[PDB]
Amino acid sequence: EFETIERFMDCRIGRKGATGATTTIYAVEADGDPNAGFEKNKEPGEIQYLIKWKGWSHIHNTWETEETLKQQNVRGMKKLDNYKKKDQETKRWLKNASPEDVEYYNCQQELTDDLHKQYQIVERIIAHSNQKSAAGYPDYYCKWQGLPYSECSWEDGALISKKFQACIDEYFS
């Protein structure tokens, strides 16, 4: 029973403890962002990485530290070392580059950020489970915006209904 890092999505100095399940986009929507109002130079912070997990869709991405990754015994830890290398190489480059380059870099980061956001949006629902929860919710097989059909995933119906009820209505139309 272990989790595997699929991809490092982002990196920040965040409030200590703002990691794990409370940082998913749906936890934040429901309960507020654990990193809200964090100001780097007035409160203790830590390096945190946004993780896309193998076998979990992008809505389940979480912020993690090197420490939490190790404590949870996740697989794919070689990707951390690679990420830290690329990051240090990128930061060296930024320090000298002409703002003409910095501009192009920033543009590619913004386009990338926008792409990543799409991955967390249900484009349409493809199928629903026969089994339903006590509360009557089936699970839903979801096609994600900007991802191919191979990246569809089963999702908790109660969770999907909080934000994508229109997709549900459309599927049952």
């Binding site: 794990g20 399940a21 998913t24 979990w56 389940h60 699970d139 089963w154 908790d156 119906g157 969770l159």
Partner: peptide, 12 residues
Amino acid sequence: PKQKRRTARSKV
């Protein structure tokens, strides 16, 4: 002991 086998989860 025979090893036996929903696909939907959430981060808890």
